[PDB]
Amino acid sequence: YSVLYNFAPFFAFKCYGVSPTKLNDLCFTNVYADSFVIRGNEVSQIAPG
Amino acid sequence: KQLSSKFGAISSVLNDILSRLDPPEAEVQIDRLITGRLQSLQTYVTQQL
Numbered sequence: 627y628s629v630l631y632n633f634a635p636f637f638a639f640k641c642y643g644v645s646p647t648k649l650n651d652l653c654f655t656n657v658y659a660d661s662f663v664i665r666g667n668e669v670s671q672i673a674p675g
Numbered sequence: 676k677q678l679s680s681k682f683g684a685i686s687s688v689l690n691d692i693l694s695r696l697d698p699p700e701a702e703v704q705i706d707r708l709i710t711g712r713l714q715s716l717q718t719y720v721t722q723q724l
Contacts, residue, residue: 643685643695643696644695644696645695645696645697645700647697648694648695648697651694652694652695
């Protein structure tokens with residue numbers, strides 16, 4: 627996850643459940659990645675509930 | 676057996692919560708676990724008495 631900050635400056639990066647600093651020590655399985663584009667003001671709509 | 680109950684928190688394992696979360700949200704997760712287990716202990720002490 628050290629290559630995330632080396633790509634581009636992020637906009638929100640708000641994280642739920644896990645902190646976006648201690649993401650290199652816990653171990654789990656089968657992540658899921660989805661990609662799309664949002665027209666600016668509706669980024670906050672991509673959230674639980 | 677009340678140790679394994681989540682009490683509405685992220686997880687029942689306390690070290691997982693302290694090792695996966697920042698203290699701003701770990702504070703409220705700790706608070707929920709403390710009040711649930713304290714209610715269980717109060718019930719146990721009342722029944723024992």
